[PDB]
Design an enzyme around this catalytic site. Sequence first.
Site, mmCIF file in Angstrom:
data_model
loop_
_atom_site.group_PDB
_atom_site.id
_atom_site.type_symbol
_atom_site.label_atom_id
_atom_site.label_comp_id
_atom_site.label_asym_id
_atom_site.label_seq_id
_atom_site.Cartn_x
_atom_site.Cartn_y
_atom_site.Cartn_z
ATOM 1 N N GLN A 19 -13.077 95.888 -73.951
ATOM 2 C CA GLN A 19 -14.305 95.178 -73.647
ATOM 3 C C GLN A 19 -15.132 94.764 -74.861
ATOM 4 O OE1 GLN A 19 -14.771 98.126 -70.114
ATOM 5 N NE2 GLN A 19 -16.212 96.441 -69.798
ATOM 6 N N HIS A 116 -9.046 104.016 -71.628
ATOM 7 C CA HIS A 116 -10.160 103.370 -70.945
ATOM 8 C C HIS A 116 -9.687 102.112 -70.202
ATOM 9 C CE1 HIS A 116 -14.305 101.806 -70.368
ATOM 10 N NE2 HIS A 116 -14.700 103.025 -70.627
ATOM 11 N N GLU A 160 -13.218 107.344 -66.042
ATOM 12 C CA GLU A 160 -13.097 106.889 -64.672
ATOM 13 C C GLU A 160 -11.713 106.786 -64.029
ATOM 14 O OE1 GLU A 160 -15.483 103.246 -64.845
ATOM 15 O OE2 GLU A 160 -17.322 104.452 -64.826
ATOM 16 N N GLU A 361 -22.405 107.345 -68.999
ATOM 17 C CA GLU A 361 -22.603 105.939 -68.641
ATOM 18 C C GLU A 361 -23.671 105.826 -67.566
ATOM 19 O OE1 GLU A 361 -19.284 103.627 -67.406
ATOM 20 O OE2 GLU A 361 -18.193 103.830 -69.258
ATOM 21 N N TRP A 415 -14.791 92.568 -66.931
ATOM 22 C CA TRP A 415 -13.579 91.951 -66.365
ATOM 23 C C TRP A 415 -13.866 91.172 -65.103
ATOM 24 C CZ3 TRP A 415 -10.640 95.887 -69.156
ATOM 25 C CH2 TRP A 415 -11.231 97.164 -69.118
#
Length: 454
Positions: A19, A116, A160, A361, A415
């Site tokens: 990202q 990730h 995640e 986060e 994304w």
Amino acid sequence: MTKTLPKDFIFGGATAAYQAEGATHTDGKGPVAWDKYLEDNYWYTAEPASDFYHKYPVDLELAEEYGVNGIRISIAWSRIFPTGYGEVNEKGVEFYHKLFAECHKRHVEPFVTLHHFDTPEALHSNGDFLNRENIEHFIDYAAFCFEEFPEVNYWTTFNEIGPIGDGQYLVGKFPPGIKYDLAKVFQSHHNMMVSHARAVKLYKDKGYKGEIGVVHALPTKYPYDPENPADVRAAELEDIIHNKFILDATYLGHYSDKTMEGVNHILAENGGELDLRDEDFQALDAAKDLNDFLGINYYMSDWMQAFDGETEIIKYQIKGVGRRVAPDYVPRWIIYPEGLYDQIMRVKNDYPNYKKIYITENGLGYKDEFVDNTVYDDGRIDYVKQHLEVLSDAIADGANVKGYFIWSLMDVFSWSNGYEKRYGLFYVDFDTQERYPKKSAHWYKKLAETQVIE
């Protein structure tokens, strides 16, 4: 009446490799599923993203200047081993050494994640973590990084795991794009947690001196109507799919009766069976007490309503579980900070061996209005403030929370929404890659050096 945070609290900022980095096809980097996917499906790609590959010194300079003392970074598995395993790509390894060197130079402690959402395409195409062979490759990768990177004192295996299973197999939004396959959701959750437990144990066995943990996305699940038992059950099953199953594998070394019972019910209704081996539980069991910290990613909660029907997610409803339905008078995603307080206490109560918690986060993303070479993002400031306030209360009430990492440090690539949806403390003019602190960055600075939530 003014809330405060501990003097040692880490005020961090988060980033992720694919990202932020860019350089998708440079310096021997190997491909990831997103490459083809974004290409023939959107008008945007991960090039140049935030060009972190080159801009890191500017970001770390700005991070230090604004009081950020911790940063989440992720090593791109495809940058080290372009094919997933085998040949090491020295330019990839050099990069991270340079990156970690800048962080220490800037006094920004790096908290590093190994995976990730970017399994090298070669391995991803081959079943990803549903393929047991890929569990070994990950462990070989983790082992390499542990040894190659002694500068890192805070490691994390995955980011995640829940959202991955959900995206790849339930909602089918992320490649392979499979939809409604609950057996694959749970199998992926399992296999990845086994990968985690084996890497965590390997790290401790080899005697490394840092700290290792895992980052879980944990959206609190509530019954639409608390007084309605069917609603309470729907929420409970929803929490098992996304949170509980994963938390049990992490902290109990096995699935509790409630989880197993719930999982059996969900699969009875939807089909499928799990492949659960004795070595799997041997692995989880050995690691249950070796996690130094837990990383909680939280943005919002979910409300469930018992209502039986076909499985459809476009709208979210699961056969045998229920439907997602937002409360009529809750502020609005939907902003619900209490969700975080509840999730923290739930971990504390259910898994007392959690040790330490970091909110890895939390953030608000929207289309920032760039004016006066900045952004008057009062909305983001208020969202974050409200969440930092519950943290103060959770700590006062006995929870061991030691840090908060805002997603994200600078504006990064999404994304789902490309460059439109922004979360950063620093605005990035994507054409010129020039950074501009937003109003929140100034506010975050005062907070770090004062630890008073005002």
